[PDB]
């Protein structure tokens, strides 16, 4: 039957959100050395 054809949808919003979140949190790893 031609009515048995259906196109699937994708949802990768959580992965995208995690990428942007990691990008922001990487600034917390920036090194600021203590001068002597």
């Amino acid at each position: 039957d031609i009515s048995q054809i259906n196109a699937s949808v994708v949802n990768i919003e959580y992965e995208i959100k995690k990428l942007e979140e990691v990008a922001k949190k990487l600034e917390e790893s920036l090194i600021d050395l203590q001068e002597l």
């Binding site: 054809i5 994708v10 990428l19 990008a23 600034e27 050395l33």
Partner: protein, 51 residues
């Protein structure tokens, strides 16, 4: 052993900034692919709706 410490920190921070930009571009590209793939998925479903 401190002259390299100043070098390791500056090279590290520069690498982080570049990695931030790469992650932003990855998220942007994935967001664009998701939209079109879903916008092309409904164009096919509605095509079955008119046939």
């Amino acid at each position: 052993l401190y002259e390299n410490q100043k070098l390791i920190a500056n090279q590290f921070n520069s690498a982080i900034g570049k990695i931030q930009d790469s992650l932003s571009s990855t998220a942007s590209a994935l967001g664009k692919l998701q939209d079109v793939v879903n916008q092309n998925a409904q164009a096919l479903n509605t095509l079955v709706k008119q046939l």
